[PDB]
């Protein structure tokens, strides 16, 4: 990596400057170099890695869905052939999106997950792994779409088993895991009933645990419970 000569503490400091500059590519490249120093990450440092890569991949997903739609509009009966340009550009963005996904999964597999012993670290990385297999699945069409989807499911399921046993139902990482896994059921795995059942059960168990919380923890958890409520309102 090209960050191999910069101090870990300097890479973390510059990741946070880059976030404020809304320079997410830089943010991601900094947190990549930080991971590659080989030390476990802190809670704050995990969020910077998450936030950095989600904004990079988020620009590419948005861009991919615009091009995917123009391409299909150009494949109906009564649509004028515009040449290969729309397909070539959709393929280029998709290829670039896939490289980010493979890079994030590389960091998770070398060696963030095997060294994550705590519930919070391990559940966070296994969620990340399910999310980035999910992004690969959104654009997969060929031979291992099924294997990609099962890789997402499998990582999502190990995270859910650990959070169920080791974290309270209002834990933001648990609530975010369940929000994402539900959306997986709904739009990747074609299990809308599984998607809705996970969302209600997650909302209800958290509701019944809010009484144990500080005002600050309450604002954190309720924020995410409202995302679950919104999804449910949309699917029902």
């Amino acid at each position: 990596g090209a960050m191999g000569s910069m101090e870990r503490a300097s890479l973390i400091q510059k990741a946070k400057l880059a976030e404020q500059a809304e320079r997410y590519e830089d943010m991601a490249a900094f947190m990549k170099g930080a991971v590659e120093k080989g030390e476990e990450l802190s809670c704050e440092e995990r969020n910077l890695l998450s936030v950095a890569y989600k904004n990079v991949v988020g620009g590419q997903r948005a861009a991919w869905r615009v091009l995917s739609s123009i391409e299909q509009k150009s494949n109906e009966e009564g649509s004028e052939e515009k040449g290969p340009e729309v397909r070539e550009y959709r393929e280029k963005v998709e290829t670039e999106l896939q490289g980010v996904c493979d890079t994030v999964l590389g960091l998770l597999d070398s060696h963030l997950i095997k060294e994550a012993g705590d519930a919070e670290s391990r559940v966070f990385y296994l969620k990340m792994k399910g999310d980035y297999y999910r992004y690969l699945a959104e654009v997969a069409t060929g031979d291992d779409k099924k294997r990609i989807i099962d890789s997402a499911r499998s990582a999502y399921q190990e995270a859910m088993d650990i959070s169920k046993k080791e974290m309270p139902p209002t834990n933001p990482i648990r609530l975010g895991l369940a929000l994402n896994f539900s959306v997986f059921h709904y739009e990747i795995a074609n299990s809308p009933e599984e998607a809705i059942s996970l969302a209600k059960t997650t909302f209800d168990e958290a509701m019944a645990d809010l009484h144990t919380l500080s005002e600050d923890s309450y604002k954190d958890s309720t924020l995410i419970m409202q995302l679950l409520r919104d999804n449910l309102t949309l699917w029902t």
Binding site: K54, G176, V183
Partner: peptide, 10 residues
């Protein structure tokens, strides 16, 4: 109106 996943984009 798009379904929510976390984290959210800037």
């Amino acid at each position: 109106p798009r379904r929510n996943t976390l984290p959210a984009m800037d």
